[PDB]
Design an enzyme around this catalytic site. Structure first.
Site: not given
Ligand SMILES: CCOP(=O)(Cn1ccc(NC(=O)c2cc(Oc3cnc(C(=O)N4CCC4)cn3)cc(OC(C)C)c2)n1)OCC
Ligand SMILES: OC[C@H]1O[C@H](O)[C@H](O)[C@@H](O)[C@@H]1O
Length: 445
Positions: A150, A186
């Site tokens: 990311k 997550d």
């Protein structure tokens, strides 16, 4: 008509979604086997989060979520009561560009701020850490960063124990004390947070800046881990699906362009088709092609439209939110330095729709693979499962989840899937895994 022909390239047939689902299933089996693990694109990383009996410790738990940064205070009381407080922190470029040490020093500074604003800097609390990056875990509180994703690029982090980096920064600061009890992905935190409310939740999924899933795998199937009894959560890291050429027949020019110009060329290819980090950029490249071919904005692109990342994924959502008057669309384009026509607005909308529909359909292929694989492993003819979902794409996109739920359900005929939209899962689950892990951890000495 030439516009429609270009936008039709994004389309996917039920036959090729089935091809993607079965290929994902093949990649998943590869990641779990000791023989193929090191070569496998989908790593299927063991998390050390195991199926738990009822309850957890009662008390105050701190949560950190990195992957904007969030500090959360979770109050677990007693049947059960779970209350949360949070604070958001924007990561400056300097903390992202530099060392792992500088990054964890800024995180530590944020923790102090949260502790001061909640009148608790003198308290030594157990801490759960959601760290949304591929990690090779040795236990629930120890894991090495395999590689950044990311667009993250802090030096001196890859190959090191992420828990160690956080502990060091807390010690260097000397302003507060925290017991780092757990580190989770997550997806894992989302699954745990939704499990608290629904015990059938055994899948966690993220559709945000990045895209990933985790699920409860039979211990017998997890070859990288010792044991045959019960279940363990596995972080698929399915964003990397397509990295060994598994998606080559589906990749378009815009996909190879996003990849070439990314921080991780050749990596996270499946993710690059779905994630909010990439979605807006795919649209900007589709719009630039239409401008180059003199089909949009009279072939005149602005300096802003020509800049990488200028078409934010938020704009894709806003464009698809448009009532019909095209006012939302016109305003985005005007700010971007363009003077669009009404037809230009409708073209922008159709391009947005083409990219997001492909994202939802690609995503559903991965989730179906996971659910179908679990159905087989559990020998359940009718499998009733809950999927906990977090992330801005899934939550805020106008039609992403409708398009995604139907496509998943068409690939899963023998399953009764319930989707829970997790409000704070990524953060709350880090504290709940800590609360569960603390039954053993606080007694180690
Ligand atoms: C479970 C024993 O395994 P270990 O070897 C590793 N290990 C350390 C943690 C750990 N597992 C977990 O955290 C864990 C936690 C889960 O979510 C919750 C949430 N809330 C409560 C609750 O009752 N609450 C009331 C207030 C919240 C309970 N569980 C669910 C889960 O699996 C299912 C998805 C099948 C595993 N495994 O433990 C030693 C550290
Ligand atoms: O944030 C969602 C996901 O983003 C990226 O794919 C990360 O590699 C993964 O660990 C995380 O779960």
């Amino acid at each position: 008509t030439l516009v429609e022909q270009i936008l039709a390239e994004f389309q996917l047939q039920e036959e090729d979604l089935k091809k993607v689902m079965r290929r994902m299933q093949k990649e998943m089996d590869r990641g779990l086997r000791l023989e193929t693990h090191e070569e496998a694109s989908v790593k299927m990383l063991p998390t050390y989060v195991r199926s738990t009996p009822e309850g957890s410790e009662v008390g105050d738990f701190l949560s950190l979520d990195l992957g904007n940064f969030r500090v959360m205070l979770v109050k677990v009381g007693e049947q059960w009561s779970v209350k949360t407080k949070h604070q958001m922190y924007s990561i400056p470029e300097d903390a992202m560009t530099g060392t792992a040490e500088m990054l964890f020093d800024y995180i530590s500074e944020c923790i102090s701020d949260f502790l001061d604003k909640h009148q608790m800097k003198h308290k030594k609390l157990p801490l759960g850490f959601t760290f949304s990056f591929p990690v090779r875990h040795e236990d629930i509180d120890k894991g090495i960063l395999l590689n950044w994703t990311k667009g993250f690029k802090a030096s001196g982090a890859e190959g090191n124990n992420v828990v160690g980096l956080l502990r060091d920064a807390i010690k260097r600061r000397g302003d507060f004390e925290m017991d780092v009890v757990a580190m989770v992905n997550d997806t894992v935190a989302t699954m745990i947070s939704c499990y608290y409310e629904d015990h059938q939740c055994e899948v966690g999924m993220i559709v945000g800046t990045g895209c990933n899933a985790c699920y409860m795998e039979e211990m017998q199937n997890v070859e990288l881990v010792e044991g045959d009894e019960g279940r363990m959560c596995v972080n698929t890291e399915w964003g990397a699906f397509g990295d060994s050429g598994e998606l080559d027949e589906f990749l378009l020019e815009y996909d190879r362009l996003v990849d070439e110009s990314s921080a991780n060329p050749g990596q996270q290819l499946y993710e690059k088709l779905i994630g909010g980090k990439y979605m807006g950029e795919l649209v900007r490249l589709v719009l630039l092609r239409l401008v180059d071919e003199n089909l949009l904005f009279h072939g005149e692109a602005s300096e802003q439209l020509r800049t990488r990342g200028a078409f934010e994924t938020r704009f894709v959502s806003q464009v698809e939110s448009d009532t019909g008057d095209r006012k939302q669309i016109y305003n985005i384009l005007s700010t971007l330095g363009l003077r669009p026509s009404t037809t230009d607005c409708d073209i922008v909308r159709r391009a947005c729709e083409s990219v997001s529909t492909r994202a939802a359909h690609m995503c559903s292929a991965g989730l179906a693979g996971v659910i179908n694989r679990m159905r087989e492993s559990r020998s359940e003819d009718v499998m009733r499962i809950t999927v906990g979902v977090d992330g801005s794409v899934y939550k805020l996109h106008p039609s992403f989840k409708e398009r995604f739920h139907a496509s998943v359900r068409r690939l899963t005929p023998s399953c009764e899937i319930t989707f829970i939209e997790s409000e704070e899962g990524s953060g709350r689950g880090a504290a709940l895994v800590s609360a569960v892990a603390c039954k053993k951890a606080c007694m180690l000495g």
